[PDB]
Every structure is written in structure tokens, then in C-alpha cells.
């Protein structure tokens, strides 16, 4: 079966190089024009570069022209992308896609049809030492019905953190939002659950934060303070 | 009688840069060398091992087509001898060559109006190439006595350099497309040869 | 250097009806062959995108016959005759004429329901933000439709900007509602100066934008 496996991701400081590699397995690699397409975090796609069936590049995106450098190899069934002089705006996923029409199968040669897509890598760029999360409480407003309370994680890097409530049992009424990014690169997010207010002043509620790279599992007992 | 697809290598819309020259096999055909010689569009058709007028009765075990794009001046560096720079760092021909070289001007197609970037050529290598070795790898290359820790000062320069290919330069600088045919008569049944 | 646009920007569809989306260009993509080079692409929530239509209207391989493509010149349309539960996500249109290629901003297709109003809450900084110089305020909006809604951060009528950010979640599978949350961060030099802090929400379901305010020093 057709497979498209890419590799090369990892944290890289700004002003360095990387070499992404996409390997194809399951078709005649010489009759298909490859493409490399980025995907910004939580945004739309964006074409980056491509290569035709005779190792002839087809130009790069307008805002990236000057640094990226694509290359091909039909003997080893591989497609390499060298990347130099990075900036903080080049963090995104990267897929390597394949064309549809085999060459000389019907005017000109074909370039469209990005049909088969591999699961992209997670290239990122930043300059910040790995710091642990800070956990903050969000007590109930103490103003009818059901009131919401939560906990906010601030100044952590990198992803992903995992937040649960009541050690894992409480699942109906939870909400956790994606990790927004901050000024200094230290991320932040929060989680909140809604419980009956008549059931706030005496029950037990704990949110549990787990950070894998920093190797921590912190507990937070959230209750109204007055 | 099933002709062989040469038209897919000569009329291709895109040609590879010099340092990553395309390398295509051809086999199991009846190659037609009549068109490739009579054509009035080429400006350099040369053959070393066998003179063009007798290619219709030589059966080769295999044949390869190299294809790339070079500067107009430097077309005089693709030959067995006649070493220089491009034949020294990007594409070197074997000394006992049995093949042909076809080079023709493509002023209109391969040159844009404001300045092209898709074409790059190598520079600053460690040692001269050996026949037919392809080195597509890019690594930051060193001038002299200095540790190479990933960045460019007066110590490590990035090898590849970019052609300008402006559409208003003299005839010595507009791009020329080059296709080099190499014939092989290795020990195996003969497959590809003319009618 | 060709810029596209799509319309509508975001539309809610309900399972069992057709829908139509229009992609517009700047230069007509009619090539010498007579083929338009536009392509229509789909992305599901949480997976790699997939191909829908290539060469204007030629249906791609392996997709059902429920999609239709039409148009020419500078206007093309995609119509889903019988939409179902497995047709949510993002749609893009991609040119193939003049390199570099381009992708449209993207149309967001989701499941429609009855309009619901948000529930609003506010959250001041704790006592852990009184010994750390960093003060954060959080405004929370949950269980509202549709996606569009907006917030003002108000401090003594002096609207701010730049420093306040926001984030939203995916559509809840069961009741099909959204949640937004905004945060405002500041130093320990002005937080203990201004008195009344307010989060203002504007949404269709509310007659007037709702202001939830708190005062310092209870
Ligand atoms: C395409 O190739 C064939 C033979 O190689 C020849 O007609 C010519 O090189 C090309 N055709 C054109 C320019 O119409």
C-alpha cells in the first residue's frame, strides 16, 4: 500500500538549519510530482514547494523564497527539504503530497491533485529553557443554577500538558481549551467544570495537572475563598 | 515497432539544476536517432564514441539520458577532457566516453522577467568529483582553519550559488538546456537499437 | 501572485439538504487547452486533508457521487446534494495555473441547530497573583450558538487592546454548542489602581451586549 513517511521534526533555535525527509513506498516514484505543504498551528494550509517528475523544481512560496531548498532522489525514493535561516514564524506541520495524473497520460505536464498525504511532523522554533507549569485557581463567582470553577496553567513549555478533574472520574461538564501562545513563548491554557452552586460550599473538587517532559503530577484543591 | 519516448525528455517543461542532474534509464525500445540529428533547433550536437551518421545499426544493452540546465558560456566544459569548474564540481564525464551531448538555447522559457531562483549551482567542495557521482547533499562548507558550528562568518560559506538568468543579458549568459546520452554495451541481450 | 476568496465564510448545514460554496479568483484560469485548473480539497477535524475535485469538475477517485462541481472563468462552485453526518470540517480551493499555487482562506462547515444564548462568568486574579507581579483576569462564555461572538475588556471606560487574548473549543458533539474564553494579563503596577473591571459580550441571541463587572476591594 502507498506510504509517505516524513521525518526531521524537533525544537530548533532561530537561525539554524533543518533537513526534512519524505520517503515514498508503493508506486513508481518517477511518475509523480511531489509537493511539500505546510500547515500553520490552528490555521489554513499553505503551499511551500514542489518538484516535477524530472527533478525540476517548480518554485517556492512568495514569502519563503530565499532560504528553502528542495531536492529529490529517484534511486532511493526520497525527497529532501533543506531549510536555513529560520525565524519564529516557521513553526507548523509539514505534509508531503503526491500528484494524481501520471506523466504523458493526458497539453502540458500535470502538477495538480495532492491526493495522498502522509502524517506530517511537528517542526517548531523557539528560544526558551524548559520551565515547569504554574497552577492557578479559579474559584466560583459566588454570585443561580450551576456555577463554574476551574484551574489555569500558565508559563509552561513545551507541550503537551494534561489536566483532569477529581482524579479522572468527573467527566460530564468539563471543558479544556487549546494551548494559547504568549509573549515570551511560555504557553498558557485553562480548564473549567460547572457544578451546582448549592453543591459548592461543602463538596470536594480537585484538578490534577500532569506534565510529562518536566515529570510532574501536581494536585490542586479548588474551593471558594472568602 | 513501438518507438521509444524521447519526446518526454526533450520537451519537458521543467529541467533539473546542474548539481542534481536528472538521470533517466531507457530500455526495450526501437530508438529513432533520425529526428535527434536532423532537427534544426539544436545548437550543439556532438558525438564522441560513434559519429552520428551510423547510429542506426548499433545495438546497446542500455542507454541513459542525463538532463540539466547550464550557463551559456560554460557549455564548453562538458567533454571527456576540457576540465574546468562545472565539470570539476557538478558533473564530470568519464574519459572513455561513448555517447553524445545535445545542447540548445532556451532563452524564452527558462528565464523570468524579474530574476529567477529555481536554478542553483555548486561551489566550494572538498575535492574534485569522480565520474558520474551525484552529490545532492547540502552541508555548510569550510573556508580554512575554523570550527564549523552551524553558522556563516569568514569561516564556513554555504556552497550553492544562485543563477540570475535575467532576460536581457548577452548571449553568453542566457540558459542552455543540455541532454547527455550515454550508451552501454554490457554483457546482456541487446534490446534498444534503431530499425 | 494570485489571490482567491471564498463564500460564504462560514455556513451551518443540516443533514439532509444540499449546500453550495463559491470560490472566486483574480485571473481567469482558462488555459489554452480549455481546462480550468482549480481543485477542491477537504479537511476533516483532526486528520490529514483529502482530495475532492480536480480539473474544475472531474470527480476525484474513491469519493461518492454526492458532490458536484461547476463554474468557469473566475467563479466556481461546489454543491453537496445530500449532506450527512460525515461532512463537517474545512474546505479549500487551490489554483494550478501560475506558480506559486495558493489556498483559499477556507470554509468552515458544521452542524446547525436552534440558536442558543451564552452563559457568562468572570474570574479575578487570586492571592497567588498578589505576590508574583503577574495579574490575570478570565472571562468565560459557554454553551452558545453560533460561532460568531465578540468581547470588550473594559477598565473605567478605557478600552484596552493587544494584551487581551482569547481561545475557543470545538463544537460539542451532543448539544452542538461552543465555548469561548478570554484572558487579560498585566503587571502589578496598574492592576491595583483601577477599580471596576468588566467583560462585555456581544452575540445575536442577546438583545443587548451583556456586561459582567467586578469591583476591587470587597
Ligand atoms: C517534441 O519532441 C519531438 C521529437 O523529440 C519534436 O517534435 C520536438 O522536439 C518537440 N515538438 C515541438 C517543439 O513541437
Number of compact structural domains in chain A: 2
Is A226 part of any domain? no
Beta strands in chain A (DSSP E): 3-7, 11-12, 17-25, 34-39, 45-51, 69-73, 78-84, 93-98, 124-125, 134-138, 146-156, 161-165, 174-176, 187-196, 206-211, 216-221
Establish whether domains C5-111 and C119-215 are of one fold: yes
Q: Which residue among C37, C49, C142 sits closest to A112, beta carbon to beta carbon?
A: C37
Q: Is B137 in the pocket of ligand 1 (CB under 6 A)?
A: no
Quick one: which H or E segment has residue B8? helix B7-10
Please identify which residue in the block is written with the cell numbers 495555473: C97
Number of CB atoms found within 10 A of residue A210's CB: 15
Helices (H) then strands (E): counts for chain B = 3, 9
The residue whose CA is least distant from atom 10 of ligand 1 is B11
Write out A47-58 in H/E/C secondary structure. EEEEECCCCCEC
Distance CA C87, CA C44 (A): 8
Residue with cell 472520574: A169
**Maximum alpha-carbon separation in chain C:** 75
Q: Beta A11-12 vs A124-125: how paired, if at all? A: parallel
Contacts of B22 in chain A (CB under 8 A): 54-56
Cα–Cα distance, C191 to C211 (Å, whole number): 19
Q: Is residue A97 part of a domain?
A: yes
Residue B76 has φ and ψ, to the nearest 5°, of: -85, 25
Experimental method: cryo-EM
- H/E element holding B34? helix B33-38
- Spatial CA neighbour of B111 closest among B171, B161, B65, B160: B171
The phi and psi torsions of B20 (rounded to 5 degrees) equal -130, 50
Q: How many residues does chain A have?
A: 226
CA atoms within 13 A on the CB side of A158: 10
Q: How far is the CA of C155 from the centre of ligand 1 (A)?
A: 74
How many whole angstroms separate alpha carbon A212 and alpha carbon B10? 56
The terminus-to-terminus CA distance of chain A in angstroms comes to 63
CB C120 within 8 A of CB C144: no
Same domain (yes/no): A52, A97 = yes
Phi-psi region of A73 (alpha: psi -120 to 50; beta: other; left: phi over 0): beta
Distances from the Cα of B72 to the Cαs of B117, B145, C196, in angstroms?
A: 17, 36, 74
Q: Where are the beta strands (DSSP E) in chain B?
A: 22-26, 44-47, 62-70, 99-105, 120-121, 141-142, 156-157, 161-162, 176-184
Question: Backbone phi, then psi, for B53, in 5-degree steps?
Answer: -75, 10
Q: How far is the CA of C211 from the CAs of B156, C122, C164, in angstroms?
A: 61, 10, 17
Nearest to A190 by CA among C179, B7, B46: C179
- The CB of B12 under 6 Å from ligand 1? The reply is no
Q: Is the peptide bond before A160 cis (omega within 30 degrees of 0)?
A: yes
- Omega of the bond leading into C144 within 30 degrees of 0 (cis): no
**CA-to-CA distance for A27 and C194, rounded, in angstroms?**
67
Question: What part of C 103-122 touches A (C-beta under 8 Å)?
Answer: 103-106, 121-122
Q: Give the rounded distance of the alpha carbon of B161 from its chain centre.
A: 17
CB contact under 8 A, A180 and C165: yes
Residues 182-201 of C with CB under 8 A from A: 183, 185
* Residue A120 in domain: yes
Chain centroid offset of residue A187 CA:
13
Structural contact between residues A86 and A125, judged by C-beta atoms closer than 8 angstroms: yes
Cis peptide before C34 (omega within 30 of 0): no
- Gap positions in chain C, given as the residue before each gap (C–N > 2.5 A)? none
Co-location of A212 and A139 in the same domain: yes
CB contact under 8 A, A54 and B12: yes
Spacing, Cα B11 to ligand 1 middle (Å): 6
Own/partner long-range contacts of A196-200 (Cβ < 8 Å, ≥24 apart): A196/A145, A196/A146, A196/A147, A197/A140, A197/A142, A197/A143, A197/A144, A197/A145, A197/A146, A197/A147, A200/A140, A200/A142, A200/A147, A200/A149, A200/A224
- Please give the DSSP secondary-structure letter assigned to residue C170: P
Cα dist from A190 to A153, A160, C35, C56, C171, whole Å: 6, 13, 50, 44, 17
Helix (H, G, I), strand (E, B) or coil at C21: strand
Under 8 Å between Cβ of B136 and A75: no
DSSP class of residue A157 equals B
For residue A198, the cross-strand partners are: none
Judgement on whether residues A121 and A10 belong to the same structural domain of the protein: yes
In angstroms, the CA A83 to CA A125 distance is 12
Residue B67 CA to residue A56 CA, distance in Å, equals 10
Task: Identify any residues that bridge with C158 across adjacent strands, giving them in sequence order.
Answer: C155
- The conformational region for residue C22 under phi > 0 = left, psi -120 to 50 = alpha, else beta, is beta
Q: Residue A101 falls within a domain, yes or no?
A: yes
CB A121 within 8 A of CB A94: yes
The neighbouring-strand residues paired with C150 are: C202
List CB contacts (< 8 A) between A16 and chain B: 150-151
User: Does the Cβ of B89 fall within 6 Å of ligand 1?
Assistant: no
For the domain made up of C5-111, give the CATH fold: Immunoglobulin-like (2.60.40)
CA atoms within 13 Å, Cβ hemisphere of C33: 12
3-class secondary structure, B116: coil
Q: How far is CA C46 from CA A33, A51, A93, A119, C165, in A?
A: 26, 27, 13, 11, 24
Identify from A61, A114, A143, A148 which residue to disrupt to test chain C contact, counting C C-beta atoms within 10 A and taking the largest count.
A114
Size of interface A-B (CB pairs under 8 A): 62
* Pocket perturbation via mutation, ligand 1, pick of B9, B10, B67 by most ligand atoms within 8 A of CB: B10
Q: Could you tell me how far CA C98 lies from the centroid of its own chain?
A: 29
Query: Which structural domain range is residue A164 located in?
Result: 134-221
Which DSSP letter does residue B106 get? -
Residue A161: all three cell numbers together: 500538558
Domain match, A70 and A166 both = no
- Ligand 1: distance of its center to the CA of B175 in Å? 19
Our CA angle for A181, A185, A186, nearest 5°, is: 80
My answer on whether A99 and A143 are in the same domain is: no
Tell me the torsion sign for CA atoms B106, B107, B113, B118: positive
DSSP state letter for B75: G
**Cell numbers at A49, concatenated:** 514547494
Dihedral sign of CA atoms C185, C190, C191, C195 in order = negative
Burial (CB count <10 Å: 0-12, 13-18, 19+), residue B158:
middle
The SS3 call for residue C138 is strand
A161, part of any domain: yes
Rounded Cα distance, A37 and A64, in Å: 12
Residue whose C-alpha is closest to residue C90's, from C37, C150, C46, C147: C46
Tell me the three state secondary structure of residue A30.
Answer: helix
C-alpha grid cell for residue A165?
478533574
Ligand 1 site, residue B10, Cβ cutoff 6 A:
yes
**SS3 category, B57:** helix
| CA-based R_g, chain B, Å | 19
Q: Tell me, which fold does domain C119-215 have in CATH?
A: Immunoglobulin-like (2.60.40)
| Residues A69, B16: C-beta atoms closer than 8 Å | no
| Adjacent-strand bridge partners of A151 | A137, A191
A 10 A CB-CB count for C102 gives 21
If asked whether residues A31 and A48 sit together in one domain, one would say yes
For the sheet with C210-215, list strands across it: C158-159, C150-155, C196-202, C210-215
Show me where the domains of chain C are located: 5-111, 119-215
B contact set with A (CB within 8 A) = 5, 8-9, 12-17, 20-24, 67, 117-118, 120, 136, 138, 140, 150-151, 158, 160
* Interatomic CA distance for residues B142 and A74, integer angstroms: 29
Which of C121, C130, C133, C174 should be substituted to probe chain A, the one whose Cβ sees the most A Cβ atoms within 10 Å? C121
- Helix, coil or strand: residue C202: strand
What's phi and psi for B11, nearest 5 deg?
-95, 10
Distance CA(A56)–CA(B22), nearest Å, equals 8
Same domain, A120 and A160: no
Residues A111 and A151 in one domain: no
C164: part of which helix (H) or strand (E)? strand C164-168
Amino acid at each position: 500500500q502507498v506510504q509517505l513517511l516524513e521525518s526531521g521534526g524537533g525544537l530548533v533555535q532561530p537561525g539554524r538549519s533543518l533537513r526534512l525527509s519524505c520517503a515514498a513506498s508503493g508506486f513508481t516514484f518517477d511518475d509523480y510530482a511531489m509537493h511539500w505543504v505546510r500547515q500553520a498551528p490552528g490555521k489554513g494550509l499553505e503551499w511551500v514547494s514542489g518538484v516535477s517528475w524530472n527533478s525540476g523544481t517548480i518554485g517556492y512560496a512568495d514569502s519563503v523564497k530565499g532560504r528553502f531548498t528542495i531536492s529529490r532522489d529517484n534511486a532511493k525514493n526520497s525527497l529532501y527539504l533543506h531549510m536555513r535561516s529560520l525565524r519564529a514564524e516557521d513553526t507548523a506541520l509539514y505534509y508531503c503530497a503526491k500528484a494524481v495524473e501520471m506523466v504523458r497520460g493526458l497539453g502540458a505536464d500535470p502538477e495538480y491533485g495532492m491526493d495522498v498525504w502522509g502524517q506530517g511532523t511537528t517542526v517548531t522554533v523557539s528560544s526558551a529553557s524548559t520551565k515547569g507549569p504554574s497552577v492557578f485557581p479559579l474559584a466560583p463567582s459566588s454570585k443561580g443554577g450551576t456555577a463554574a470553577l476551574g484551574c489555569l496553567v500558565k508559563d509552561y513549555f513545551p507541550e503537551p500538558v494534561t489536566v483532569s478533574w477529581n482524579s479522572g472520574a468527573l467527566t460530564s461538564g468539563v471543558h479544556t481549551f487549546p494551548a494559547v501562545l504568549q509573549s515570551s513563548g511560555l504557553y498558557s491554557l485553562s480548564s473549567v467544570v460547572t457544578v451546582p452552586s448549592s453543591s459548592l460550599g461543602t463538596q470536594t473538587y480537585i484538578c490534577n495537572v500532569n506534565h510529562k517532559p518536566s515529570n510532574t503530577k501536581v494536585d490542586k484543591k479548588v474551593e471558594p475563598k472568602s | 515497432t513501438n518507438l521509444c519516448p524521447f519526446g518526454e525528455v526533450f520537451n519537458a517543461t521543467r529541467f533539473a539544476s546542474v548539481y542534481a542532474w536528472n538521470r533517466k534509464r531507457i530500455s526495450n525500445c526501437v530508438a529513432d536517432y533520425s529526428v535527434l540529428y536532423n532537427s534544426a533547433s539544436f545548437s550543439t550536437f556532438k558525438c564522441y564514441g560513434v559519429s552520428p551518421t551510423k547510429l542506426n545499426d548499433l545495438c546497446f544493452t542500455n542507454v541513459y539520458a542525463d538532463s540539466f540546465v547550464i550557463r551559456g558560456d560554460e557549455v564548453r566544459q562538458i567533454a571527456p577532457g576540457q576540465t574546468g569548474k562545472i565539470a570539476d564540481y557538478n558533473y564530470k564525464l568519464p574519459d572513455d566516453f561513448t555517447g553524445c551531448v545535445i545542447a540548445w538555447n532556451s532563452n524564452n522559457l527558462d528565464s523570468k522577467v524579474g530574476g529567477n531562483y529555481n536554478y542553483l549551482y555548486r561551489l566550494f567542495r572538498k575535492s574534485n568529483l569522480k565520474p558520474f557521482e551525484r552529490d545532492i547533499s547540502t552541508e555548510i562548507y569550510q573556508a580554512g582553519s575554523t570550527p564549523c558550528n552551524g553558522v556563516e562568518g569568514f569561516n564556513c560559506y554555504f556552497p550553492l550559488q544562485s543563477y540570475g538568468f535575467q532576460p536581457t543579458n548577452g548571449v553568453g549568459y542566457q540558459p542552455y538546456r543540455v541532454v547527455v546520452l550515454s550508451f552501454e554495451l554490457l554483457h546482456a541481450p541487446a534490446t534498444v537499437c534503431g530499425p | 501572485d494570485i489571490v482567491m476568496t471564498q463564500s460564504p465564510l462560514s455556513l451551518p448545514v443540516t443533514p439532509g439538504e444540499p449546500a453550495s460554496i463559491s470560490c472566486r479568483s483574480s485571473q481567469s484560469l482558462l488555459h489554452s487547452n480549455g481546462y480550468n485548473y482549480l481543485d477542491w480539497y477537504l479537511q476533516k477535524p483532526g486528520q490529514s486533508p483529502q482530495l475532492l475535485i480536480y480539473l474544475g469538475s472531474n470527480r476525484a477517485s474513491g469519493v461518492p457521487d454526492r458532490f458536484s462541481g461547476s463554474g468557469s472563468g473566475t467563479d466556481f462552485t461546489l454543491k453537496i446534494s445530500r449532506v450527512e453526518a460525515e461532512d463537517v470540517g474545512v474546505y479549500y480551493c487551490m489554483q494550478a495555473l501560475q506558480t506559486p499555487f495558493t489556498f483559499g482562506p477556507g470554509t468552515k462547515v458544521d452542524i446547525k441547530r436552534t440558536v442558543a444564548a451564552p452563559s457568562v462568568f468572570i474570574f479575578p486574579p487570586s492571592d497567588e497573583q498578589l505576590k508574583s507581579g503577574t495579574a490575570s483576569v478570565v472571562c468565560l462564555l459557554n454553551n452558545f450558538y453560533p460561532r460568531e461572538a465578540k468581547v470588550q475588556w473594559k477598565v473605567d471606560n478605557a478600552l484596552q487592546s493587544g494584551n487581551s487574548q482569547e481561545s475557543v473549543t470545538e463544537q460539542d458533539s451532543k448539544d452542538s454548542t461552543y465555548s469561548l474564553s478570554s484572558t487579560l494579563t498585566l503587571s502589578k503596577a496598574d492592576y491595583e489602581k483601577h477599580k471596576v473591571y468588566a467583560c462585555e459580550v456581544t452575540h445575536q441571541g442577546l438583545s443587548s451586549p451583556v456586561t459582567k463587572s467586578f469591583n476591587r476591594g470587597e
